[PDB]
Design a protein around this nucleic acid. Structure first.
Ligand SMILES: N[C@@H]1[C@H]2CN(c3nc4c(cc3F)c(=O)c(C(=O)O)cn4-c3ccc(F)cc3F)C[C@@H]12
Ligand SMILES: N[C@@H]1[C@H]2CN(c3nc4c(cc3F)c(=O)c(C(=O)O)cn4-c3ccc(F)cc3F)C[C@@H]12
Ligand SMILES: [Mg+2]
Ligand SMILES: [Mg+2]
Ligand SMILES: [Mg+2]
Ligand SMILES: [Mg+2]
Lengths: 695, 690
DNA sequence: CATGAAT
DNA sequence: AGTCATTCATG
DNA sequence: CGTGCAT
DNA sequence: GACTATGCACG
């Protein structure tokens, strides 16, 4: 993987540690083979503060580093036998680039202090903008007086990378200096160590979620602080955790908003996946195609989502975990229900933002015509926080929300008469009313999920245990192996043979027992020692007001209602303004009919368009907007001189405006709309429970 | 790789040989695990009739079959020690699937005859449309409509009912009707000798519950199908615009998406996806690789695609994946598409029948020669070097004025190939032979230069190398000479190429015959190679070995078609307008009566009918008149309109003349060809020697 | 052995 | 996101 | 261990 | 077109 320099020289030769092969390539070319070596880093580097020193020695990335640098590692580290005088870390100028600098620095610290303490560890700062060339937004505006936003290294040409960051005379480097051995140790541990509590706290103290954001020296304590801070913030807000209102992670939201913009919906032909992904990756989500597709695939799997938001034709995976077809084979499109998440988006009902390009606005949250967060759930791993929200029956969640709208201050006990608990797509049995309450109240709670079973008598006095429903998030294939392993190992007596018998229209696992076999002894052992029964831990974290918040039912349902409120208000203002303008025009038209000839005469007498309008104003007191409409009518309209039809539209419009004003100017009338609409969604999408409950 | 059947049973168990892992998945899903096993084939099976039985034994796909079959191979083959009653071959219902069925059949014939002779080899017949239909006629019956482009697009539940269910599926049972009449066909289609195949293709291929089929007949409808496709719609360029179908789609799609040289770069993945979705129904990787190649200036004399980012190097290291790179058409590429919006070129339906695509581009310049092509199908192949834009055009221009121009004269304008990697081309005679018959072997030699050093030691400095030669591999093979001391003299080998220059230095030892060495490297490394012309293209839907003349005539013919087409289009436009403008000028003469007649009309339709009947306006005019906006009624100036009426009449005159006068037309075609030359002309890179 | 659209 | 093997014609 | 967006 | 390792929190 190493691309050596032509000659050796432990005094001039540099070692660029590049993020990714493709960038490691553009570097191999742009470099100067005389003294600049290249060593690509494929993937995120192993955290040498958490992983066991055993898994560390086995990591190819690390071992090949301790070698090429050539000076051993840790205690047996002689700074004299090194091969490079400068180790330059070069990553994308993105958040994941920051994460890498972090993971790396904690390594050159722990197992190569000497190297960093000597100021031999630098950090290449690639340019962010290119008009022109500038690093800070400030240097930007200056070049505009005298832009290709670089989202990564793979975007720039070789002769581009050399001139801007690779040329020792034209580049800028943040030389890592250890200014305080003590204040640097505590800084690294808090961020990279095992303990999670401290790290979570440190983020809560330093990271401001509510607000925004030639070689120069910089402390490790300060460097590790700045970098990990960024990666922290970004991963928390814009990656791992769902928005409390629409229950979507940014990637899922873009997949939907994109597919919808491209008219790729349930009422229309399937569109090839590779085409959907590509448009998403080029307009909204600047990340690996594979991730985008994987995300899109999951939204389509009915054994992971209680209400799939994407319909996909072809091999889209299975409960056995076997891989789905690549994006070149599959077709896809939004499910009908997903359409309800996007309802009214064209009506200015949601806060939009700019995309990485700055070429197109994207929604920060979707209108959500139903409480997606609870219905489909989420999960759920970031930095300092994590989330596991289970799926819920669409109807129940709605019955709850509708209640809470009439009773703002409802307690959990009353809500649970509507929302008894989770409803897994995979069905099965949920035990633990108490812990459910605890979860619905605090966000955390441990429940038990047990497989749905049944006994079948067989010839020869033999019995047979049959499993027809398994626990959420459990791999059928592996479960079957683990059970068969019980038999093979004889950890419990009486298992004759295991057999996955499920087919395209039914799940079925037959655990055939032996002649004289205690089928109760077996069924119990399996529940306890395999995943026929498991623990599900509610850990409901979500993003509220830009910050990660551990939340229960109340905060969720209220944040939703809140949101729906803003949306319906906005929607109603939009539709009113439209009806006002149209009402205005229709009013003018009805006048025009009574003076048709005069108006034609008056336009004939006019010199041009503008003059016609002034005459229409001065002579008949029409408004600008009314004159503009009259003057631009096509001649044939003079054949449709029918006032009663117009008067019907006038009336229909006044009424529409009345009802919209009522919504806008009265909170109760608005809340009734929410209820009316929520019930409609309920009637149209309602479906029976799949998971039964037990206490 | 195998997914086995629950219970072992030689009497009922079926073994599905599926094309691809993806389809292999959908199969495991919609299958009946009781007795149906699955075995994916990852890539084209190895031709067990062309390759050595040595490399044939070291084949994973082949081994796991001999193992999964469980009857061994060759002569040590017991049909009683098998594992399946039926061995089903299940591929896509496309051309490449057909080719796969062909490869697996020559294996089961050459190394498991008894299995085939026992009618145990079948072939699944997936549906082609969807009620489901296999025949284009069985659809019309269901008319009283999706098109499967592969197994992937089929949900596992549909797969079962239509092609996997023994009680609902259709199977072609392979049977050897004549062992002697079938030995020839397999030997000819899959043999090592080309000539017999080429001919077979010529003679037969016309470029224009279960059922038994012979091995002879089954190997025909299949290889015949694949041959025709890989020839017309894959490996070989159209003789006119010099593009293969993939490249044409890449350009056309990108162009339709407005992803051009004068606009911001678009993400590669976004383009590729749009291509694969609307036009080219194949791998996104291939499509990308093609797009990338069209952007590499050491492989194209005139790049058609500009691509920001790591698109590769002469060292041949991989380009950034399409997730990283952005791209757009080059300005010259624009000229390949020039006038495409003016119905100047034959369109057809895409695979999806949802959108039309062009079958050839207008080609405002002779791409086929300028950029070349290459070049491997079935029974045919192609190698066409790139040429100097200016030179090719000079020839075309001359041949326009002198249709029957001899090649000797044409070579005063088009002296020979002009590789973008420069270097030295040797063989005036062979160059002619090539321009004359389409074949010819020329020599390409690296641009060398000696540099004396300090100590009586010289040094060889290469500045240019042979087209299609990997710089990194060359430098290795040269250094291998030094390491092996095949010839004495070489001191060290240094690739000293930088971002702005190509330089390989071969330092020599003191008192070392630097002639002997340079000669050895020319012979035993790619410092010097033979380039073989094999100019094959597609003319009138068929492959044709051609020379400089047919190529240039085919071009000129085409340009004629385009220019004629383009002119009819612009003329029809000017006409329709001029026609409308006549009515408007008239209307003004009778404005009040016309408003009156509209005011008296019952509706739009009635108003037009009144205009025609009472004032003799035409439909087109009544529509224009009746959809005027009221404010028009303010105007009464006829002069401005008359000026437009004049301008249009002149444009129609000139355009008509181009269509009625062959000379006026050719003049035009020359005029433009020259503008292109003046705009994109560049100096020679390769030097010529005899 | 490479080449370049394919699986 | 690189890597691995095969087709086809050709010298 | 294995989850799901990232590299 | 599958395979291969990492981060991050959590039982
Ligand atoms: N020593 C470690 C190399 C890198 N490995 C994997 N890389 C994957 C992936 C999977 C890997 F095992 C991906 O799945 C992926 C993607 O975009 O989906 C990108 N990559 C990926 C590949 C290269 C790279 F530089 C960065 C990446 F994120 C494993 C061994
Ligand atoms: N025994 C041989 C399998 C197939 N291998 C490769 N496959 C590639 C590719 C490269 C391979 F080495 C590709 O490059 C590719 C593509 O679309 O670009 C598709 N494929 C590809 C992979 C799997 C498959 F089923 C069909 C394919 F075309 C290697 C081992
Ligand atoms: Mg990046
Ligand atoms: Mg991946
Ligand atoms: Mg196919
Ligand atoms: Mg490939």
């Amino acid at each position: 993987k190493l691309t050596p320099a032509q000659s050796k020289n432990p005094a001039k030769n540099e070692l660029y540690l590049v993020e990714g092969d493709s960038a490691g390539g553009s570097a191999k070319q742009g470099r100067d083979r005389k003294f600049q070596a290249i060593l690509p880093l494929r993937g995120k580097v192993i955290n040498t503060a958490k992983a066991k020193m055993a898994d560390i020695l086995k990591n190819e990335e690390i071992n090949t580093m301790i070698y090429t640098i050539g000076a051993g590692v840790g205690a047996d580290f002689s700074i004299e036998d090194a091969n490079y005088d400068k180790i330059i870390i070069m990553t994308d100028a993105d958040t994941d680039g920051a994460h890498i600098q972090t993971l790396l620095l904690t390594f050159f610290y722990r197992y190569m202090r000497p190297l960093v303490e000597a100021g031999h560890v630098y950090i290449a700062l690639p340019p962010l903008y290119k008009m022109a060339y500038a690093w800070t937004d400030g240097e930007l505006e200056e070049l505009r007086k005298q832009l290709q936003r670089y989202k990564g290294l793979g975007e720039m040409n070789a002769d581009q990378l050399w001139e801007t960051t690779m040329n020792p005379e034209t580049r800028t480097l943040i030389r890592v200096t250890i200014e305080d051995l003590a204040r640097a140790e505590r800084r690294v541990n808090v961020l990279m160590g095992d303990k999670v509590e401290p790290r979570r706290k440190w983020i809560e103290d330093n990271v401001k979620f509510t607000l925004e954001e030639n070689i120069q020296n910089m402390s490790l304590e300060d460097i590790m602080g700045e970098r990990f801070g960024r990666y922290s913030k970004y991963i928390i807000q814009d990656r791992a955790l769902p928005d409390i209102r629409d229950g979507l992670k940014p990637v899922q939201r873009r997949i939907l908003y994109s597919m919808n913009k491209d008219s790729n919906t349930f009422d229309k032909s399937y569109r090839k996946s590779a085409k959907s992904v590509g448009n998403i990756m080029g307009n909204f989500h600047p990340h690996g195609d594979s991730s985008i597709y994987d995300a899109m695939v999951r939204m389509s799997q009915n054994w992971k989502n209680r209400e799939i938001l994407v319909e996909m034709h072809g091999n889209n995976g299975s409960m056995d975990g076997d891989p789905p077809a690549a994006m070149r084979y599959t077709e896809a499109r939004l499910s009908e229900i997903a359409g309800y998440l996007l309802q009214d988006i064209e009506k200015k009902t949601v806060p939009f933002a700019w995309n990485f390009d700055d070429t197109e606005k994207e929604p920060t949250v979707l209108p959500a015509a139903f409480p997606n967060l609870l219905v489909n759930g989420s999960t759920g791993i970031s930095a300092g926080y994590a989330t596991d929200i289970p799926p819920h029956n669409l109807a129940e969640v709605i019955d709850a929300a509708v209640y809470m709208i009439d009773h703002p201050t409802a307690k959990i006990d009353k809500l649970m008469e509507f929302l008894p608990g989770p409803d897994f797509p995979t069905g099965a049995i949920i035990q633990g009313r108490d812990e459910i309450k605890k979860a619905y109240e605090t966000g955390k709670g441990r429940v038990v999920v047990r497989s749905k079973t049944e006994i079948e008598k067989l010839k020869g006095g033999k019995e047979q245990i049959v499993i027809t429903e398994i626990p959420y998030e459990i791999n059928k294939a592996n479960l079957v192996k683990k059970i068969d392993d019980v038999r093979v190992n004889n950890k419990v007596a009486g298992i004759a043979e295991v057999r996955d018998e499920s087919d395209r229209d039914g799940l079925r696992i037959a655990i055939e027992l032996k002649k004289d076999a205690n089928t109760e002894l077996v069924l119990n052992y399996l529940f306890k020692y395999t995943d026929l029964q498991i623990n599900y831990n509610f850990n409901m974290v979500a993003i509220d007001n830009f910050t990660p918040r551990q939340v229960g039912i109340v905060p969720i349902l209220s944040s939703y209602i809140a949101h729906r409120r803003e949306v319906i208000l906005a929607r109603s203002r939009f539709d009113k303004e439209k009806a006002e303008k149209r009402l205005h025009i229709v009013e003018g038209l009805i006048r025009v009919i009574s003076i048709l000839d005069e108006v034609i005469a008056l336009i004939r007498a006019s010199e041009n368009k503008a003059d016609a309008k002034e005459n229409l104003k001065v002579s008949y007191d029409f408004t600008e907007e009314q004159a503009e409409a009259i003057v631009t009518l096509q001649l044939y309209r003079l054949t449709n001189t029918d006032v009663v039809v117009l008067q019907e539209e006038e009336a229909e419009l006044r009424e529409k405006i009345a009802m919209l004003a009522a919504i806008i100017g009265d909170e109760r009338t608005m809340y009734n709309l929410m209820k009316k609409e929520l019930r409609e969604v309920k009637k149209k999408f309602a479906t029976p429970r799949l998971s039964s409950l037990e206490d």
